[PDB]
């Protein structure tokens, strides 16, 4: 299967990404508390629902929340301001709150059923969000000996996500609040002066440079 690419809403960030975030891949956004990781996730949950000529994939969404940060009214606002129906957009997002890291791991395995269910409909699942990917593992696996044990369980969780991305042609997008890392692509996000947000690719020897965008009623835009 040819790769699909989901626009972020930022044409500069889309250029860094070669067109958008890719299916058959795990994209990690990481940065300090407050840098906009969850806003980028909200914006992507709408953009994927657009038709391809508008940067989407006519796709459904599955969202795993670990910090109670998902906001349906934010989804509806972004949808409305980009020309889509707010309730229809909300309807095509499946939502789960992970109670702990072990619940988080079972929810990903359980997601394969709905993915198969929607696969050959007109709105197959095209985006799987995990926000936050690491917060539960950080609180549960801590102290002497936890570095190896935590990285092992996290590697298996990420392996499960890679398999779903590749088997079913899905883009996986994960956040991490800031060690080896397993994601396909890592994006560093930070706040700038004057309400700007700045993104940069990490340890990706393609495009060099930084994208600068704002958080708006459309989600994000340059």
């Amino acid at each position: 299967a040819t790769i699909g690419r989901i626009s972020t809403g930022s044409k500069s960030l889309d250029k860094l990404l070669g067109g958008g975030i890719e299916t058959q891949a795990i994209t990690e956004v990481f940065g300090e508390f407050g840098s906009g990781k969850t806003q980028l996730a909200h914006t992507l949950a709408v953009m994927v629902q657009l038709p391809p000529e508008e940067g989407g994939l006519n796709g459904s969404v599955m969202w795993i929340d670990t910090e109670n940060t998902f906001r349906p009214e934010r989804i509806r606002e972004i949808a409305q301001n980009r020309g889509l129906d707010p309730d229809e957009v909300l309807k095509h997002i499946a939502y789960a709150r992970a109670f702990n890291s072990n619940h988080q791991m079972l929810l990903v395995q359980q997601a394969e059923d709905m993915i198969k269910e929607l696969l050959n409909t007109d709105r197959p699942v095209k985006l799987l969000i995990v926000d936050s990917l690491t917060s539960h593992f950080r609180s549960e696996y801590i102290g002497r000996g936890a570095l190896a044990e935590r990285q092992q369980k996290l590697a298996k969780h990420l392996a499960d996500l890679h398999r779903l991305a590749n088997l079913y042609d899905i883009a996986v997008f994960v956040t991490n609040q800031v060690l080896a890392h397993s994601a396909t692509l890592r994006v560093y996000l930070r706040k700038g002066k004057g309400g700007k947000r700045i993104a940069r690719l990490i340890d990706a020897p393609l495009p060099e440079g930084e994208a600068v965008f704002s958080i708006t009623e459309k989600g994000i835009e340059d």
Binding site: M62, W63, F70, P72, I75, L90, K91, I93, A94, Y95, A96, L107, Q110, A111, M114
Partner: peptide
């Protein structure tokens, strides 16, 4: 899992 539930609908948003």
């Amino acid at each position: 899992w539930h609908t948003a």
